[PDB]
Amino acid sequence: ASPFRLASAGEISEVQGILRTAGLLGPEKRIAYLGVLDPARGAGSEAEDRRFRVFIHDVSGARPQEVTVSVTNGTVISAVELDTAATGELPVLEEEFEVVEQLLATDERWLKALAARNLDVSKVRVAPLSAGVFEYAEERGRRILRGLAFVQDFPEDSAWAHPVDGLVAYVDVVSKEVTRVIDTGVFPVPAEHGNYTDPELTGPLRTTQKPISITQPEGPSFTVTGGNHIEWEKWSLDVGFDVREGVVLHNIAFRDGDRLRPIINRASIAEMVVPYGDPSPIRSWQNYFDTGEYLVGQYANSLELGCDCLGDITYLSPVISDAFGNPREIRNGICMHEEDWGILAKHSDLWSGINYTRRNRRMVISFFTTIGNYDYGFYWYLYLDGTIEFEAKATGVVFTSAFPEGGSDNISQLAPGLGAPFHQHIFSARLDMAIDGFTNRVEEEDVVRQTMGPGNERGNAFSRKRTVLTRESEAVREADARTGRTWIISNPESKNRLNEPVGYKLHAHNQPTLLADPGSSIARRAAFATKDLWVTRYADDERYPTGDFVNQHSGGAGLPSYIAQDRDIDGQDIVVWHTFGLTHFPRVEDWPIMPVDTVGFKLRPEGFFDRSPVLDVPAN
Amino acid sequence: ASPFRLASAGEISEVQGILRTAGLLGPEKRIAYLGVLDPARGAGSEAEDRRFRVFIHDVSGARPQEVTVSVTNGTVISAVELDTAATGELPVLEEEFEVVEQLLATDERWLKALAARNLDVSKVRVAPLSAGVFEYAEERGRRILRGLAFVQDFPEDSAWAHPVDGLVAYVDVVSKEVTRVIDTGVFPVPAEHGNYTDPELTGPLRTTQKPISITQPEGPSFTVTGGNHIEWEKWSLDVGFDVREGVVLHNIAFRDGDRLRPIINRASIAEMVVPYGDPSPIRSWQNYFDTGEYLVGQYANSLELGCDCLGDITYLSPVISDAFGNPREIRNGICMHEEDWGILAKHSDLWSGINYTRRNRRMVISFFTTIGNYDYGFYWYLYLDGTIEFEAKATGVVFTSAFPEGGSDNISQLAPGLGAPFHQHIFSARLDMAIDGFTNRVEEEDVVRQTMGPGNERGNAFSRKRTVLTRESEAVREADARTGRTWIISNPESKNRLNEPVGYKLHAHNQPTLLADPGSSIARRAAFATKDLWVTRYADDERYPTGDFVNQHSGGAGLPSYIAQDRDIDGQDIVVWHTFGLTHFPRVEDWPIMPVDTVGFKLRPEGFFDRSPVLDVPAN
Ligand SMILES: [Cu+2]
Ligand SMILES: [Cu+2]
Ligand code: NA
Ligand code: NA
C-alpha cells in the first residue's frame, strides 16, 4: 500500500513490458539506470501512481533517452532524446567494463608496450576507469573508458600488488576502438605479492580470540511492516533502495507522546567523488564519481550472517534491473539490527541519595558496496536520544603505482618499489529537511569570544551568535572548527514549551574539502566538494549535487547552477547538502588490505523536545 | 612482583604507621593526597623500593607538609613544609564540603538573605566550590571555599532544579569564618521539580525494549596477571590507579612477532577544568579543576554488572587512603572487557575471486566519577589494528542558575525561570611517549595545496609537509582543521623495512580551546587549555599541566614554567600533552538529567609496522 515501498520484481518486469510495447526497448537498447520516483509534494495526491525513471543506452550509437513510466497505468509519461555532448553521458554499464581488456589485448600499440616490459598479455588485467573531461577533443560525444594495467601472476593472485606504471590507454566502448595508447617509459613492476590469505604472508593464524556471542532471546525491539517500514523506540521511517544512491531513508519521524513529528523527509548520499593527487600523466585524470558514474547500489554485496552483520539481523533483499530490464535480487543486501551503545545517562546524587543509570542503544541500517579495489560501508544510526548519525567505512585494497626512484611528494611507499598515490574520498549527504513540517530555516552558529572589560570584568564570559541564511546566494558555507561552527535547522513556526523554535543541530567532522586547484577539471565537475554546506530550496528535479549525467560531463550542472536561482530559504521547504570526506595519505599499515577508516556527521536535537526524550527508558 | 602493581591495603596501613611514628599524623592532621610514585628512569632497575607521596593538611592552621615515605624500608625519605601563599593550597578535603553549609546556617547575613526569600534554612543545600584567585587580598594564604545555594523541597528532591540566584558566600574553612556574603538581588527560585525518577515526569516506562544478551561462552580473550597486568591480542600493559588522576596506563607495548615493542610509557588524564562563562558576579569566579582541586579518583563509582558494564566483565577494586590514613577499597571501580567493533577489513575481488571479511574488536578499560552535579566516564580503548583511543563521556545534571527576565547572552533557558550557564569541559592527556624506545621526536603534518602550472598541468596534485619540533619553545602548537593538521611521534633511530622512521599519528577532534580572555585569572591558571598540543622533555617532577598544588594558585604553574626551560626535544625522552574539550551551550534536552556527550582523541600507527598488523586474525 505504501508509496515508499521497495520496488518489486513484478514492477521491474512491468516497466520492461511497457518500454517494449512502446518501441523503446528493442535488442540494441540497454537500461543504464532504473529507479522509482518519489511522490510529488502533496499529502495524499494520487491514490497510487508508481512512476519509474529510466536511462536507455543504444549500443549502435543512436542517441540515448530519458524515459518516465507509470507502472500503475501502463503508460510512458515522457521520453526525451539526449544530446550527450551537451548534457553528459549515461552511467557506465557493467558490460562495458569487460570490453576494455579484450580490446587492448589485440591492439598492436598495447602489445608492443607489454613486450617492451616482458609481460605476457594473458596475465595483464586492465582496470577500466571513468574518463572525465580533459584536453582530448575527439572524446566529446563519445563513451570513453581509460585503462590502467596490473599483472596477475596466477588466477588467485592480487593484481593490485603489480601495477604496470608508465602506461595508459583510452577506449571508445561503443565503436570498440582504442583511441590512444600512451607509454611514458618502463617502470619495474613491483614483484612482492599482496595475497592476504597466503599463510606465507599471514603467518600462523591467532588462536587467542575467544567468541563474543550477541543474541536477542525475545527477538529485536523493532518491527518491520509493509516490507520496509520500521518502527523502533519512538522512531518511524521507511528504508528505500536506489541503484544509484544505495540505501535511502524516507519519512524519518519521532513519536513524541501522541504526535508523530517529522524530522527528515529524505536522507541519502547523493554523490561521492574520489580524486587522485598524483600529477603523473598516467593518473592525473583519475577521479571516481562512484555514485554518479558507476551507481553504488548496483555493486552492493550480499552480507553474510555472523561475518558482515553480527547479532539478531533482519535483512532486506532489494531488487534492481539488469541491463535488459529483468529483475535482479541483491540477496541480503541490507542489514538491520539494534545494538547496545553503552551508558545513556548517569548520576549519583549526594543530596538526594538517588543513584541512576540508563543504557543507550542504536538502530543500525547498513549496506556495503565494492567498486574495483575499494569497498565502502554505508551506516545510518538512530539513537534513543534523538540523535541521527551517518558513518562511511572505507576499506579494500589501495590503488597502487610504481614508487619512483628518488621519491615522490604525491605518492606513499608501501613495499619495495610499490607506491600508493595520495587521494581523497568525499561524500555529499542530501538531507531534505522537515523539522516538525516543511517550513524550515538554517542558522549558522559560531562561538563568540568576549574581551575583558565593563560587564565582563573578570574576562570569563563567552557567548554565541546565530546568523539566519535567508537566500540561496548566501547559503554556501565553510567549516570553522576554531569557532566551533555548527548549523541549526529550525522551524520558526513550531515552538517548544519555552517559546523557542524547535531545531536540530548539524555537527560536522571538519575534515578538509577538495584540495585540487580551483581551475581544475575536477573542481568544476565536483564543485559541491569545495564547500562544507549548501542550502537550496526544494525542487523535484534537483536530485544530485553533480546533476543527472555526471559521466564525461563538463561543469555547468548541479549545485552551482541551482544556487543561482537565489530562492528564498527562510522558513521554506529546504534541502541541506553536506560535504564531508577523508584525505588519504596511505600508510604501510594499509597494505596489503586496508583496515577500516571512517568519516561521517551527526544531527542532535536542539530544543526540539520540551525536556530529555529518554526519561521513560526503563532500568531493565 | 611488579613495580607497577596497584597499591594494597597493607601498603596504605604501613604508610599510616610510618607517618604516625614519625610524629607527622597527629589528630590535627589530614591526608589530602596519597599515591604511589612511579619508578625512576632505569632500564636495569632491580631493587624494589615502593615509595608513596603524601600531602598532609593541618586543621589547626599549621603549615601543611609534603612527605615521601618508603614502604619497603619503613622510613620517611623527605618531609618539606609548604608555604601555600607561594606554591598553592592542598586539594579540597571531602570533610570540608559539609563545613560550608553548616557554617553558613548560623551566619546572620546568610540567614537574613534566606529570610527575605522565605526559604527554610533546613532546606537549603550549599554547593562547596573552589575559590580560585581574584581580587580579594585577604584570601592569599588562606583555605577558602565559595558556596552557592540550592533548595531541596524534600529529602529525595533534586536540588539542582531550585537554584538561589543573586547570592554567594565565601568561607575560610580552617578558621571557620564567613568572610563575605554577597546579595545582589532577589531572583525567583525556579519552582518546577527535576526529579527524573518521578512517574509524573517520566510518564509510563517503555515496554518496547527487548533484551540484548552479550556473553563470552569460553571467557574473555585477555589475561590478567599480578593483579593489574593485561595481555590481549598482542597488547601488553599495566593498569594503575591514582587518587588524583584516576586510571593510569603504564608500559603500553605491542608484541610484533617475537619482539615486545613499547609505544607509550605512561598515559593519563592529568588535569580537567570546567570554566564557566557567565559574567554575573555570583558565578564569574567559577572554575572547577576536577582533577587538580578535587581528585577525580577518590569519587570513582562502584560499577554495577549489567547496568554500568555489560558483557563478560573483569573488575579491579583499587585501594585509596581516607583522610586519616585508613585504606578504603573502591569495590568494582574499574571495568575491563572486550567488545565487538564491526568490520576490520573487507574486500571482494573480481579478478582473484576471493571474498574476504574480518571483524574488529577493542579492549575497554573504564571508570566513572561523580563530582557534585557532574558525572564523567573515562574510557581507554585498544584496537586490533594498533589504534589507541581515549573517550570521555559527560553526563549528570547541568549546573543551574536563574534565567533572567529579558534573556541572557551567557545562559540557556531549560525550564520556566531556570537557566544553565555556558561552560566548557577541557581535558589534558599527558602521554609519556616511548615509540620503540625513548628516543622520540614530534613532527607537525599539514596538507599542502599546489597551484596548477608546470609539473601540475591538470591542477590535481596535493601533498603534505612535516615540521620537526626541535626545542620546547617551538613546541606549543595549535590545531588547524582546514589543513588537516596532525602530529606524528616517531623514533628517528628505529626504521621500518622501508628505511623510514617508525611512528604514531595523533588525530585530534579539533574542538575549541579555552575561550576566556587571555588576561583572565583562569587563562593564567589553566594555561595548558589555551593550546592544543605541548611537548616537553621528560622530568620526573613535571607531572601535571597545572603544577602540583592547583587550589588557589595565582597562575603560571605547570606547562608554561616547564617549557620555559627550552630543552632539546629532537630525538629525546619526551612527553606529549594534548588539550581537548567540549564547549557546552546547554539545550532543553539536557534537562533534568543529561544524555551522554563525548570527546576524545586517538593515535594510529604510521609506518610503525612493516605491513598491516592484523593479517593473522582468523575468519571465525
Ligand atoms: Cu583511500
Ligand atoms: Cu557541561
Ligand atoms: Na525540505
Ligand atoms: Na618519553
UniProtKB/Swiss-Prot annotation, chains A, B:
Cofactor: Cu cation; L-topaquinone
Positions bound to Cu cation: H423, H425, H584
Note accompanying the cofactor annotation: Binds 1 copper ion per subunit. Contains 1 topaquinone per subunit.
Keywords noted in UniProt: Copper, Disulfide bond, Metal-binding, Oxidoreductase, TPQ
Residue numbers bearing the 2',4',5'-topaquinone modification: Y374
Post-translational modification: Topaquinone (TPQ) is generated by copper-dependent autoxidation of a specific tyrosyl residue.
Any one GO biological process: amine metabolic process
Membrane-spanning segments: none
GO MF, one annotated term: primary methylamine oxidase activity
Enzyme class: oxidoreductase
Pfam name, any one: AGAO-like_N2
Record's keyword annotation contains DNA damage: no
PROSITE patterns, A to Z: COPPER_AMINE_OXID_1, COPPER_AMINE_OXID_2
Known catalytic reactions: a primary methyl amine + O2 + H2O = an aldehyde + H2O2 + NH4(+); 2-phenylethylamine + O2 + H2O = 2-phenylacetaldehyde + H2O2 + NH4(+)
Domain of life where this protein originates: Bacteria
Protein residues bound to substrate: 288-299, 371-376
Disulfide-linked positions: C309-C335
EC number: 1.4.3.21
UniProt induction comment: By phenethylamine.
List of catalytic residues: D290 (proton acceptor), Y374 (schiff-base intermediate with substrate)
Quaternary context: Homodimer.
Task of the protein: Catalyzes the oxidative deamination of phenylethylamine to phenylacetaldehyde with the concomitant production of hydrogen peroxide and ammonia.
Name the record gives this protein: Phenylethylamine oxidase
